[PDB]
Amino acid sequence: VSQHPSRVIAKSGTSVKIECRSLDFQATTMFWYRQFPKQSLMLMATSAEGSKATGVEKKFLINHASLTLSTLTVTSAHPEDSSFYICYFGPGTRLTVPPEVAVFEPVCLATGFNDSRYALSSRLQNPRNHFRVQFYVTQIVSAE
Amino acid sequence: GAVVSQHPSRVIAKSGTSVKIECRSLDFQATTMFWYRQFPKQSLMLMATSAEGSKATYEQGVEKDKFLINHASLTLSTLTVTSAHPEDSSFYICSALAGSGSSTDTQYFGPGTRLTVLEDLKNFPPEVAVFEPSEAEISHTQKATLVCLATGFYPDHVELSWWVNGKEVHSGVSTDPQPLKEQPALNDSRYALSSRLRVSATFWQNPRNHFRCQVQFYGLSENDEWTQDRAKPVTQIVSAEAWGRAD
Amino acid sequence: KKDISNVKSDLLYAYTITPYDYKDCRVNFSTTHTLNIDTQKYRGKDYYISSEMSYEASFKRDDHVDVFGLFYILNSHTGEYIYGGITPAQNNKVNHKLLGNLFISESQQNLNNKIILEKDIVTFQEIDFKIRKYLMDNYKIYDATSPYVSGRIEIGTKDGKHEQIDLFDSPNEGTRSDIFAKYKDNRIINMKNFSHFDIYLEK
Amino acid sequence: DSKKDISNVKSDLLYAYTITPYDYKDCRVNFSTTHTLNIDTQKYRGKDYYISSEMSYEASQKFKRDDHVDVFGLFYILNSHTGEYIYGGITPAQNNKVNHKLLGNLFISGESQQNLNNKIILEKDIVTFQEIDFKIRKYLMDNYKIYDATSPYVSGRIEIGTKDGKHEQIDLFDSPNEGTRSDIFAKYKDNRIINMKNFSHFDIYLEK
Amino acid sequence: KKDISNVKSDLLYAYTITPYDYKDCRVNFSTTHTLNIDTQKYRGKDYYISSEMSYEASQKFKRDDHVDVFGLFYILNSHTGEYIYGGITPAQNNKVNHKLLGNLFIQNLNNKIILEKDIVTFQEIDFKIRKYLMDNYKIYDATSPYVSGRIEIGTKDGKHEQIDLFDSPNEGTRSDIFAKYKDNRIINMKNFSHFDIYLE
Amino acid sequence: KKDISNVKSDLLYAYTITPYDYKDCRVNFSTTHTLNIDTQKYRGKDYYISSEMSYEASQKFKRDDHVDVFGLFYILNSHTGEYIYGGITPAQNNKVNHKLLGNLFISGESQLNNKIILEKDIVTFQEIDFKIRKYLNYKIYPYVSGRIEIGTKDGKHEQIDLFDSPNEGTRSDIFAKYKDNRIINMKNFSHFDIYLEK
C-alpha cells in the first residue's frame, strides 16, 4: 500500500491529491487516519464493505474507486500544513504552505527551516567516504 | 446439429410430369437452403436457394425458374422441376446452414436424388447370378473372391451389398462406381453392373455356409406411350446364392 | 404497377408455409415494438417467440396467450419470429364453422362450412391465412398457369362494416417480411361479430 | 287416431301459411291492456282502422301509448269491424332504411348441403320470429313445396343461429288442437324477437 | 428520500469509479434474479461477474452466450467474483464508433462522447455522461450552482426517457443507487437519436 | 464543372427562391412522366402543380391520394400551371416539428443542433437540401467547394454537392437531380454534416 504523492507543498486555495494504491494485491475498505506531527491516530472518513459510501466538524473528502485507487481531497482550509495523511498500512504523505543548513566533519546539523520557526537535529579515517532530511517547490537536501 | 435428408431419393416418371423432391431435416435448426444440380460429373451447378430461413429467395444464373422451390418449415423444402423429359434426368441435391441473416461461410449437404425421364418404356428387370472362386486364385493367393453380375436391366437404378451367412455384410467387397451399358453409347442400351466379395480359402472351403448376392430393385414401368407388352413386371428384386465347398 | 406474375410467385413462395400454432402459451416479457412468448412445452428448452407488432399496441408478463403466425426468418436457435397473430387464450374448446361466398368474374359459389376457426377471439392474420390456403389448394390462385389476376377477401361484420384484404399484393421486394408486414397490427376480431366472408376473384 | 299425425298437418299448415301477411310500418300505439297491444293502422287502411295484437303478460309491458311500432303478423281470424287480429308480430319502429341479406343452409336427408346465402331478405334490425318463421317457410313452400300433398317430407325444423351459440328451434311440421290459424299462429303470442346483430344464420333440416 | 447535501456527495463518491469493461465474455450459469458471466481472461482463473437483475432481466441469457459486461459495482471482494447490477448486453461482433449528438441547457455537445456498441446498456450511457458532466462542469461537488437536473435520452420513436442526475435513495450506498440498473434496460443505437441534458 | 466562377452565382440565382409549400392536395392524374396536383385551395380555380418525375417515380401516386408538396420551379407563366421536379410526399396527418441535429466542418479546425426543424415524417431530399442550403449565415455561393452528408440510422450516408451546376445552369438544369423524387422517413434520419472546403 502506497501514498504515491508522499510529502508536497500544497498551497492556499488548493485541493490536495493523494492516491493510495496497491497493484500486487486486492483490496476492500480503506481508512484515512489523520493527526498533527504529534497527538496520534486521529481520523477522517473511509469506505465500507467493498464500497458502502463513506464529531461533526470535518473539507477532507475521500472517494474510494477501484479496489486499487482511492484518494483524499483537501480543499485549502487555513494553514495546518501536514500530518502524515495515511491509508495493512501505507507510508506517509505530508502537506504545507526554508533551507540552508550547516554540517561538521569527524556530527551533523540541519538548520534554517508571529512566525514560529524551528530546527531539527541528528548526529553520528577512511578516505572521502560519505554520510547524507526534510522540509515540505518541494525540498530535500543533505550534508555529505 | 446433425444430418438432413432428401426424401424422393429416386424413381421414374413420364415425360411431362413435374417431379416431387423434398429436403427433409431432423432437429438441427436449419435456416437457409440451397438446391444444387449435378448432371454427370463437374459437381454442383446451383439452381436456387432459400434466403435466411426464407425472408425471400431467388433462382440463379438466369433462365426459367421453372424449377419451383419453396421453403415452408425449418424442416421442409422442395424442388419441383417442371415437365419431365430426357433433357433433364440429373442429380438434384440440397443443403442447410447455421449462423443467421449474415455473410461468412456455408454448412452442409444431402444424398442428392436420381431423376430419370423415359417414354416408349420397354424397360426390363435385372437377371443376376454369382460365380464361385477359382482353383488358381485359391492357389497362389489363398483368398476367395466371388463375383456378382447384374445385366439386362435398364433404368440405371439398382443396389449392391453381398450376403455372408444370412445377414448384412460389407467388407472386402467392391462394386463398380456405377453400372455400364452393355452396348456402349447408343440407346436402348441395357445396363450391367458387378461386384467382388473375396474372403478366405478356408471359410470358402466350408459348406452349409451361405452366400448370396443382392441387386436391390428401385423403380418400375412407365405407362404413357402404351404400357405392358408381355410379362412386363413390377419393382423386381433379384438375387443369387452359392455355398462354399472344399470338394 | 401491375406485375401480376412476379407476385403470384412471391406469394406462392410465401404462403406455402406451415404456420406457428402454439396455444395456451405463457409470456414472460414485452418491450415496446415486440412481444415475447414462451414455447418451451412445444419447441423445447429456452425456446421463445418474438411477435413484432407495431408499438403502443404491445398482455404483459405471465399472461396466457394463443399464437398463430407466419414467420419471416430463422436460426437464432431459440426464437422464431413473426408479425402478430397473438391473442388471449381460448379456454374452452370450440368449433365455429364459417360462412362465406366466392365470387369470380361463373359467379356465386357456395363455400359455407369448410373453414372452421376454433377461437372466439381470432386474429385476422389467421383468417387471412386459412382463407388464402383454401383457394390455393382448391383454386390455385398463385399458380403461373392461371386467370386470377386480382382479388381480395372481404370480411363482413355484425356492425355492418366489411374488412378488406388484398389477395394479390406484395410490397417493395416480395420477401416474406414484405408481406406479413401487414399483420404487424395484430388486429383481431371477436367471433360474435364475424358474419361471413365474401371472396372476389377477378379474372 | 285423430289426435295428431302426419297429414292434416301438411295441410292444416298449408292453409294457415298460404296467407298474405300484414306489413304496416311506423304505426303509433293506441293503448295497451295486459293481453293485447292495440296499434293505429289508419294511414294504411282508412279511418278508424286498427290492429289488435294479442300478446303475453311478459310482452304487453314492452310497448305503450304513442309508441312508433312496425307491424308484421299473420291474421288468425277476420273482420266485420274495422280491426285486424293477430298474435304479436310487433317491434320498435325501424328508423333508417336497411337491407339484411341472410345466410343459411338447407339440409336434406337425401344429399344434404344445399344453399341459401342471399335468398331471403329482412329489412329490420329487430325482427320477430313470426316474420322470420314466415318469410323462411313461404320460401320452402314457393320452392320446395314442402307442405304440398304429394310430398317426401314428414319431418324438418328451422334452426336460428345466435352469435352467442344459442340456436332456436322451429318445428316446420306441427299444428296443435283442432288445427286452425288461431291454433297454429298462437305460438307467436309471446312476441319473441331477435336483434339482427345477434342473428348469425339459419339451418333448415328435412328428414324422410 | 431527503437532503440536498448528503446526496450530491452521496453520488460523487461512487460516480467517481472505474467501470468493469470486459468485452465478449461467456456466461457460466444463469439462475433467478442474476446472471453468471466469465471474466477469467480479463481477471484470471476462477474470476467471474454476477449480475443482480430483475427476474425478467434474466431468462434473457443462459449458458455460453457471448455477452459484454459494463457496470459500476456496489461492494468489492469475495475472491473470484465481481459485483454489479445489469449492464450485461449481447457482445458486439464488429467494431463501431457511435458519436453521440446532444444538447445542454442551464453550450454544444456533439461528438464529445463516443459509444462502442450497436446495442448499448443504459448504465453505460448513464455513466459516460455523468462523468463528462462531472469532469467538465463539476456538478456533484460541494462547490456548484446546481440543485437539480436530469438527462433525457430520446429515441427515433418520439420518446424521451428520463434519467435523474440529482437523486440518492434510502440509505445511500452503492447498492442503494446502482439498483436502478437492475432492470438491464437496453437501447439500440439505430433507435437512439440524441441526448438533451438539463442543468437546474 | 465550369470552375467556381459563374457557379457560386448561378447558384445564388437558383437557390434564392421561394418554394411551393402546398400541404394536403390530391392526385388528379399521373403519367409515366408526371404527376398533376390540385393547387386549388392555395392558388385558385383551375390551378395545378406539375411534378415531372422519373419513371420509377410516377409509380404509385394515383388519383385521390392526398399529397404534401414541396419543390422549386424552373420557369413561370403558362398562367394556370406550375412546374417543379419531384418534391412530392404522402400527405402528413398529425402536426409535427422535427428539430434536426447537425454539425458544420470548415477546414481551419472546426469542432447546428436545433437550427433547422422539419415538419414532415416523410421528407424529400429536395426540401432537406434546400432548407439546409438556405441556412448557409455563412453566405456561401472563401469556400471553393463542399457537400452535405445525410446520415441514416443504418449507416448509409447520403451525399450532396453544394457547388455545381450542369452547364447553362438554369434552375431547370440544377433542379433535375430532384427528378427521382428521393425521400427519407425521419425515423431513419440521424443527423447531417456539412463539409466546406476553403
From Swiss-Prot, chain A:
Keywords: Adaptive immunity, Cell membrane, Disulfide bond, Glycoprotein, Immunity, Immunoglobulin domain, Membrane, Receptor, T cell receptor, Transmembrane, Transmembrane helix. Glycans are attached at N114. GO terms for cellular component: alpha-beta T cell receptor complex; membrane; plasma membrane. It comes from the Eukaryota. The keyword Disulfide bond applies. GO terms for biological process: adaptive immune response; alpha-beta T cell activation; immune response; T cell receptor signaling pathway. It is found in: Cell membrane. The connecting peptide (CP) domain is essential for signal transmission in response to antigenic stimulation, likely downstream from ZAP70 recruitment. Alpha-beta TR is a heterodimer composed of an alpha and beta chain; disulfide-linked. The alpha-beta TR is associated with the transmembrane signaling CD3 coreceptor proteins to form the TR-CD3 (TcR or TCR). The assembly of alpha-beta TR heterodimers with CD3 occurs in the endoplasmic reticulum where a single alpha-beta TR heterodimer associates with one CD3D-CD3E heterodimer, one CD3G-CD3E heterodimer and one CD247 homodimer forming a stable octameric structure. CD3D-CD3E and CD3G-CD3E heterodimers preferentially associate with TR alpha and TR beta chains, respectively. Constant region of T cell receptor (TR) beta chain. Alpha-beta T cell receptors are antigen specific receptors which are essential to the immune response and are present on the cell surface of T lymphocytes. Recognize peptide-major histocompatibility (MH) (pMH) complexes that are displayed by antigen presenting cells (APC), a prerequisite for efficient T cell adaptive immunity against pathogens. This is T cell receptor beta constant 1. The chain holds residues 7 to 123 of 176 of the full protein.
From Swiss-Prot, chain F:
This is Exotoxin type C. This toxin seems to be coded by a bacteriophage. Zn(2+) binds at H157, H191, D193. It comes from the Bacteria. GO terms for cellular component: extracellular region. GO terms for molecular function: toxin activity. Keywords: Signal, Toxin, Virulence, Zinc. Pfam families: Stap_Strp_tox_C (PF02876), Stap_Strp_toxin (PF01123). PROSITE patterns: STAPH_STREP_TOXIN_1 (PS00277), STAPH_STREP_TOXIN_2 (PS00278). It comes from Streptococcus pyogenes serotype M18 (strain MGAS8232).
